[PDB]
Write a protein that binds this ligand. Structure first.
Ligand SMILES: Nc1ncnc2c1ncn2[C@@H]1O[C@H](COP(=O)(O)OP(=O)(O)OP(=O)(O)O)[C@@H](O)[C@H]1O
Ligand SMILES: Nc1ncnc2c1ncn2[C@@H]1O[C@H](COP(=O)(O)OP(=O)(O)OP(=O)(O)O)[C@@H](O)[C@H]1O
Ligand SMILES: Nc1ncnc2c1ncn2[C@@H]1O[C@H](COP(=O)(O)OP(=O)(O)OP(=O)(O)O)[C@@H](O)[C@H]1O
Ligand SMILES: [Mg+2]
Ligand SMILES: [Mg+2]
Ligand SMILES: [Mg+2]
Lengths: 390, 393, 193, 441
DNA sequence: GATTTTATGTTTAGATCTTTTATGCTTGCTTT
DNA sequence: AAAGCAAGCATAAAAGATCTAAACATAAAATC
């Protein structure tokens, strides 16, 4: 019955599950060396020992060990550009500490975790912390009182519990109350809490209320993929350098280097060659790091090409970038007079403006205020002539 | 497709072409329908009666489930979904319960049936010009509802605006535009002359006068009366319902000197030029100090901010201390400032003799800006009924 | 005379789409007319051919508020002659409730608007357009308490709202005339000391 | 009259092909094979992937997805491992409605017969707990997110942040496939969601930029196919309906044609497309908009005119529907106006021509009109009231727009270029000559 | 099994932060 | 000397954009 099952979910005794595959999973022996190279190159498969992160690993390990043996607790704030492997490092060091606790070299502890964007309202986080405590579920105000009752009361034995915090910035409110309580909770010496928050901007507590994972350079981003590949020589040794040069400057994501190599491995599968070539990596970088705004302007119909020339001529003639539609239509009638092809009457030109605005070649207003709607140019003006002649 | 247009042509003369177009697009129901049909024309073109006659004729004659709607009723989208599903899924009862566009799409998706009964759907949204003012996901869904629900529908829309006003920043799918031209004068004469039998049978209802009504209210006499009427009002309006509504009353005042004994254009061209003055309008005092306050309000809102030192772009807004100063200057008796006089200020506010533009939160601070709203003629009537001329200032 | 003319107009519209409506040129003051309107409601609950909800301008900040107070006032006036949700009281529920009750007899649906001047123009035009959309299925009449003159009705109503309306004017007596009658007939009547 | 029944059969078949037939795809051999091999890789091998179709509106985005799923679903290896989660941005407005449609359409145990219990936060935590349980031994989930940009318009892009995070963990073998129109929608994503995204994109700019294959597609859509193609398409539609769009479709098997009738019809269509007039009209439409939805709309309104009294397609019908397309309608609205509104329009034209597009008002135009009214000797009889009704009627047909006070004293702006007014003076029927002499002044 | 009650998730309307614009007002220069 | 236009200016109000407090309808369980 539905009532017994919703009570089974709310007390948590029913395990969530997905339907299993009816067909068995495919056997490992049939996989090609390129296919195994692709499967080891997926972003999900985090190595047990992370290449080129050993300094931050030993820092977090010595810190959390010296805070979890001495029973004192506190706060720590790691931060950096996304793609720097923060959460993989902190989850890896907590995994090593729990593996240590199974061998009883360390006092036992419960590892809690949250994630700010897996919540709805920020106050719902008060339910989730308690959901990984006793496992009981309750409304957030009673959850607030019970988190207080586990935290305000000096009642030994109080086991230390770490609190990893994904995405602290999404927990901000107009009151900023939840993040403020999550920071104030370690200050109680009786409830031996320690919190490890993970964030992107480096100065958030100053901005609206340490450790910094710097982005990978060319050699670290070489080292990550060349340890990920294993002993197969499916990649030539310069293709990883080419990926590291074209990714280490732009953003430094580890995920971008990995799926660029994976998509290049897929293009090598399309070429039916067992080893990649550097032009495969050139094709993968040309596809995944691109805008087709040149190809879009090349493949618009001729009246939108006339319209796109006319907005650029209007930014030249009036000298401002945002234009009223009537001056664009006057420049349109000039260019259509020069080319010798007639232009559609202005309602169809409003349709062309709305269609190019849907494609974000230009930023246009709703067409209820025709011949007074503002028009910006979104594509850069040189790309128009570069797509139209070349 | 033949029976529907053949049954709607006699009711709707001078409109054979638009009926031919709609009866080819959504006439037969075994055929598929286009995803949306946007027909439009001026006020009084005859489209609400046209689509309503088309939906009731198709839903009585054939397999379709029809639904009419008026978009001004739908001040929130769930009321629109309730009316649409309440007509499209008959006898649902009070088990109907739609919350958003997804639930309406699923409950319309379940209504799909086998092709062998060849069902269709139709939806008409009158006054669709309001549809762009509301939630602004309703128009893109309403155009491609056939693709979305995988049914066999066709969402008609109706407005006076051309379709090019309707576009938004995300764009819309395909639509079938359709224009209805307003009538030229010969066709408006044909429309007003089609009802000659009904107006003769009405005139027979109200015996020498009935003896001359039955002998001299014939067809060509009514055609000459219609030419004599459209010689006058056609330049002022082509709106066919107003021409019917005024043409019957002017026939009632026209018929007197053929009830007794051209030979008529003078007798009716008298009253017709008074009848033009009362087009569109459809019909069938002040306290003394409020008079002086309305006079001083017109002086404060017309005689500028700097002419008033020597007397003492549209109308100009003014603070009320300027109004009390002009009231003191024009009063020549100097009344004490009782509560009743400031109450008279607030009653000229409430009766739309004055208006507010700003300062509403601090009217007692005197910083509020007011705006007198009266033309020259009535304030001259006020200065006449007082006898105090206002043209000197 | 005016009250019997109004009741005769309501019954003659029950004898009967452009909605009938009857403006009544009330004086510039308000409270003197109020009891007059209540007496009119009693007459339409005397002959039992109409039910009536006053639609004061305080209740019409928006079109949604106007429609809910209209439907709630009609259903609660009918209950008072003999508690559904505020979020549910749409015009469609009013149509289903009217055909749920009144069909085997046709009681008129009266909506007094005592302060025609005080309304915001947009909500008023939308309300008259909605009531024009539903006339024929629901027998409506509308009465306008215009505190000024006919130019306010012809000016405030737009081209199209005036095109879809059928207004007829009645006149209550002017205030100086009323003070003249009250002074000749009561305060100068001999029989009070 | 069986031949007239044959023409009714051709007309119904043609309207079904132009309007329905959601599966068949023309061209795009590279992108369709790319999406198809990605879907087989996420169905069989258990890889998680992300993809983002982009293109102009009216390019074959949804039709490509229907062709790929119609090829893959009756494999019955794809049909047993995959649970497909369709999603839209127009219908699933705020994220909670999308999450309820996910929990309903995955047949999760929390849902029951199309209705889900519990709080939305509970449904979110339960959905992540279900996707957490998957290894490679779980069924592969295939999200298809049409209108990705409106999902970017959600708060925090929060659903998207989860939908890519499952792709970058070794949990359930999903496959996110966004489909959207904007070509820089990847800029809209927040830098976390931009980081989690696989950056691969697939563009579908239409291949019919040249005129000749546009005429080839027009020759294709009007032709009746040979009968063995009808048998093969009937077998394909039957095999897909044995196992959503499938309940109503093109279904060629209800229609059968004699080969001589196919030869006569396609001879008529190739001969009609050979003529210079039909090529001129299609040249005009191809200069307007290349997108195939426009040509399918034009073809539907051409095919609908095939009455039994005039059975054959002719080039003059092409020219007639092209004349309906290329004409303006504001010029067709201004010819409906009566002479008083037209004089108010021409007074606004003279005012904004003399003072150069300055804003106007009813009283300034009343002065400019009463300069003409007292010398007209045909407009003497009108008052302030009829002209005020004409002014409000010009306001409500949106030939005048407010600059965004009395009804007679709003500021206003004209909505027309002068060529529209100069043309509507010409195309108007029976304009009085005195207004024409004012038009020449 | 039905009612009631109340605990809670959802909705809706107001509150508040931008920022635009903007306009009455300051005051200050300039001019007849 | 004052009268009028002007650089600006400084708060104000008008969307408008976005969030929070109050309401409120619904789910669910306690009890009769
Ligand atoms: N040293 C490394 N060796 C191999 N792979 C790595 C390394 N560091 C990071 N990665 C890759 O990057 C991903 C790390 O994910 P993680 O969640 O830690 O990123 P993040 O820095 O926390 O991003 P965000 O801060 O935006 O959540 C893993 O999928 C892993 O494949
Ligand atoms: N060809 C015709 N023959 C007979 N009557 C006609 C014809 N055309 C219009 N009418 C009359 O027009 C009236 C309907 O016009 P309709 O109300 O559809 O205009 P509208 O576009 O809805 O105006 P609005 O949108 O301003 O309400 C009917 O009373 C009908 O009798
Ligand atoms: N490449 C194509 N091949 C076949 N038919 C096409 C193609 N492109 C468009 N069409 C036709 O256009 C109509 C709509 O196309 P489609 O559904 O692909 O656009 P769409 O994906 O809805 O665009 P959007 O999602 O941006 O609104 C369909 O009737 C289809 O027959
Ligand atoms: Mg992380
Ligand atoms: Mg209408
Ligand atoms: Mg699509």
């Amino acid at each position: 019955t539905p009532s017994q099952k919703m009570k089974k979910i709310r007390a948590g005794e029913l395990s969530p599950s997905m339907q299993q595959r009816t067909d068995l999973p495919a056997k490992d022996s049939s996989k090609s060396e390129l296919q195994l190279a692709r499967e080891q190159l997926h972003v999900s498969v985090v190595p047990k020992s992370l290449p080129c992160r050993e300094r931050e690993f030993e820092n977090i390990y010595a810190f959390l060990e010296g805070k979890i043996q001495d029973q004192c607790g506190g706060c720590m704030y790691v931060s950096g550009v996304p793609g720097t492997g923060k959460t993989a490092t902190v989850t890896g060091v907590i995994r090593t500490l729990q593996r240590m606790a199974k061998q009883n070299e360390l006092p036992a502890f419960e590892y809690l975790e949250i994630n700010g964007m897996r919540l709805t309202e920020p106050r719902q986080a008060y339910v989730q912390i308690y959901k990984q405590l006793t496992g009981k579920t309750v409304s957030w105000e009673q959850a607030h009182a019970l988190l207080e009752k586990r935290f305000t009361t000096p009642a030994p034995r109080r086991v230390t519990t770490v609190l990893l915090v994904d995405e602290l910035d999404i927990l901000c409110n107009r009151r900023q109350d939840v993040v403020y309580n999550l920071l104030d909770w370690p200050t109680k010496s009786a409830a031996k809490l320690v919190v490890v928050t993970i964030a992107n901007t480096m100065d958030l507590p100053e901005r609206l209320l340490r450790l910094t994972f710097q982005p990978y350079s060319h050699k670290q981003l070489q080292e990550i993929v060349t340890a990920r590949l294993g002993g197969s020589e499916t990649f030539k040794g310069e293709a990883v350098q080419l990926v590291a040069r074209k990714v280490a400057a732009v953003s430094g994501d580890a995920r971008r280097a990995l799926d660029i190599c994976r998509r290049a491995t897929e293009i090598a599968d399309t070429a039916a060659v067992k080893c990649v070539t550097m032009l495969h990596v050139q094709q993968a970088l040309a596809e995944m790091i691109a805008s087709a705004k040149v190809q879009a302007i090349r493949n618009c119909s001729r009246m939108e090409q006339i319209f796109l020339q006319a907005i650029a001529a209007e930014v030249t003639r009036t000298g401002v970038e945002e234009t009223t539609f009537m001056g664009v239509y006057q420049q349109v009638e000039t260019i259509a007079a020069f080319m010798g092809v007639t232009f559609p009457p202005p309602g169809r030109a409003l349709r062309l403006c709305s269609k190019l605005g849907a494609e974000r070649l230009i930023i246009s207003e709703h067409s209820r205020n025709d011949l007074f709607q503002k028009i910006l140019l979104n594509v850069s003006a040189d790309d128009i002539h570069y797509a139209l002649r070349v | 497709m033949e029976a529907i247009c053949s049954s709607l042509e006699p009711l709707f003369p001078c409109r054979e072409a638009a009926i031919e177009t709609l009866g080819e697009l959504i006439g037969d129901s075994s055929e598929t329908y286009p995803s949306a049909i946007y027909l439009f024309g001026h006020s009084g073109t005859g489209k609400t009666a046209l689509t309503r006659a088309f939906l009731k004729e198709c839903g009585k004659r054939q397999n379709v489930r029809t639904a009419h709607l008026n978009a001004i009723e739908c001040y929130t989208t769930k009321i629109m979904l309730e009316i649409l599903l309440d007509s499209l899924a008959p006898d649902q009862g009070d088990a109907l319960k739609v919350d958003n566009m997804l639930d309406f799409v699923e409950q319309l998706r379940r209504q799909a049936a086998t092709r062998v009964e060849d069902q269709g759907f139709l939806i008409a949204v009158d006054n669709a010009e309001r549809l762009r003012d509301m939630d602004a996901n309703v128009l893109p869904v309403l155009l491609r509802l056939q693709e979305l629900t995988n049914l066999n529908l066709c969402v008609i829309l109706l407005s006076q605006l051309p379709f090019e006003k309707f576009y938004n920043k995300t764009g819309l799918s395909e639509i079938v535009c359709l224009h209805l031209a307003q009538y030229n004068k010969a066709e408006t004469q044909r429309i007003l002359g089609s009802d000659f039998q009904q107006v003769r049978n009405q005139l027979l209802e109200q015996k020498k006068r009935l003896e001359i009504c039955q002998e001299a209210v014939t067809e060509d006499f009514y055609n000459n009366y219609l030419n004599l009427f459209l010689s006058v009002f056609y330049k002022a309006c082509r709106d066919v319902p107003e021409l019917q509504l005024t043409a019957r009353k002017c026939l009632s005042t026209y018929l007197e000197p053929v009830l007794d004994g051209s030979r008529l254009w003078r007798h009716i061209a008298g009253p017709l030029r008074s009848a033009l003055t009362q087009i569109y309008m459809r019909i069938e005092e002040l306290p003394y100090y409020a008079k002086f306050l309305l006079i001083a309000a017109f002086l404060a809102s017309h005689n500028a901010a700097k002419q008033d030192k020597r007397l003492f772009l549209g109308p100009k807004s003014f603070s009320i201390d300027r109004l009390l100063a002009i009231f003191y200057a024009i009063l020549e008796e100097k009344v004490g400032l009782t509560c009743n006089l400031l109450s008279q200020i607030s009653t000229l506010v409430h009766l739309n003799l004055l208006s507010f533009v700003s300062g509403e939160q601090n009217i007692m601070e005197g910083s509020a800006r007011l705006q007198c709203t009266i033309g020259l003629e009535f304030v001259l009537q006020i200065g006449k009924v007082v006898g105090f001329n206002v043209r000197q200032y | 005379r005016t009250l019997e003319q109004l009741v005769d107009f309501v019954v003659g519209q029950a004898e009967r789409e452009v909605l009938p409506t009857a403006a009544l040129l009330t004086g510039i003051n308000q409270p003197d007319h109020l009891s007059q309107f209540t007496a009119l409601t009693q007459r339409l609950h005397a002959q039992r051919a109409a039910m009536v909800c006053v639609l004061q301008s305080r209740d019409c900040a928006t079109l949604k508020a106007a429609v809910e107070t209209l439907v709630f006032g009609l259903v609660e006036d009918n209950a008072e002659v003999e508690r559904l949700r505020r979020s549910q009281c749409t015009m469609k529920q009013l149509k289903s409730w009217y055909t749920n009750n009144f069909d085997s007899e046709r009681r008129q649906l009266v909506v007094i608007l005592p302060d025609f001047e005080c309304f915001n123009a947009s909500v008023l035009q939308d309300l008259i357009l909605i009531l024009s959309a539903h006339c024929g299925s629901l027998p409506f009449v509308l009465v306008l308490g215009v505190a000024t003159a006919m130019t306010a009705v012809h000016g405030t109503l737009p081209y199209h709202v005036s095109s879809k309306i059928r207004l007829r004017v009645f006149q209550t007596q002017a205030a100086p005339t009323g003070l003249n009658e009250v002074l000749d007939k009561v305060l100068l009547s001999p029989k009070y000391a | 009259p069986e031949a007239d029944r044959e023409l009714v059969s051709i007309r119904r078949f043609l309207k079904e092909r132009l309007q329905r037939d959601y599966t068949t795809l023309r061209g795009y051999a590279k992108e369709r094979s790319n999406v198809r091999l990605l879907l087989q890789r996420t169905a069989e091998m258990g890889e998680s992937n992300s993809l983002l179709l982009l293109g102009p509106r009216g390019s074959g985005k949804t039709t490509l997805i229907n062709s790929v799923l119609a090829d893959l679903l009756p494999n019955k290896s794809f049909g047993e491992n995959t649970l497909i989660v369709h999603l839209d941005g127009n219908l699933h407005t705020d994220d909670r409605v999308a999450l309820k449609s996910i929990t309903v359409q995955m047949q999760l145990e929390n849902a029951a017969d199309g209705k889900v219990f519990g709080s939305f936060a509970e449904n979110l935590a339960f959905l992540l707990q279900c996707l957490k349980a998957g290894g490679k031994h779980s069924k592969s989930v295939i999200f298809i997110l049409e209108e990705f940009d409106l999902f970017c318009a959600h708060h925090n892009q929060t659903l998207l942040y989860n939908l890519f995070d499952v792709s970058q963990s070794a949990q359930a073998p999903i496959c996110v496939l966004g489909v959207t129109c904007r070509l820089d929608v990847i800029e809209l994503l927040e830098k976390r969601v931009k980081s989690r995204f696989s950056h691969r994109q697939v563009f579908l700019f239409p291949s019919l930029r040249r005129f000749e294959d546009y005429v080839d597609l027009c020759r294709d859509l009007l032709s009746l196919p040979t009968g063995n193609s009808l048998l093969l398409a009937a077998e394909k539609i039957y095999n897909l309906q044995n196992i959503y769009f499938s309940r109503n479709h093109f279904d060629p098997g209800e229609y059968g044609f004699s080969p001589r009738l196919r030869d006569a019809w396609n001879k008529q269509i190739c001969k009609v497309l050979a003529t210079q007039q039909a090529r001129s009209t299609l040249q005009a439409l191809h200069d307007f908009d290349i997108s195939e939805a426009y040509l399918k709309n034009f073809l539907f309104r051409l095919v609908a005119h095939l009455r039994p009294q005039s059975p054959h397609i002719t080039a003059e019908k092409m020219a007639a529907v092209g004349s309906q397309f290329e004409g303006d309608d504001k010029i067709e609205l201004l010819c409906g106006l009566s002479v008083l509104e037209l004089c108010l329009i021409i007074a606004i034209k003279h005012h904004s021509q003399i003072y150069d597009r300055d804003s106007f008002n009813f009283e300034i135009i009343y002065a400019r009109f009463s300069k003409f009214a007292k010398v007209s000797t045909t407009m003497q009889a009108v008052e302030r009231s009829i002209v005020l009704k004409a002014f409000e009627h010009l306001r409500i047909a949106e030939l005048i727009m407010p600059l965004t006070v009395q009804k007679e004293f709003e500021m206003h702006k004209l909505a027309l270029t002068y060529s529209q007014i100069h043309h509507c003076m010409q195309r108007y029927q029976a304009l009085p000559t005195e207004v024409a002499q004012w038009a020449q002044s």
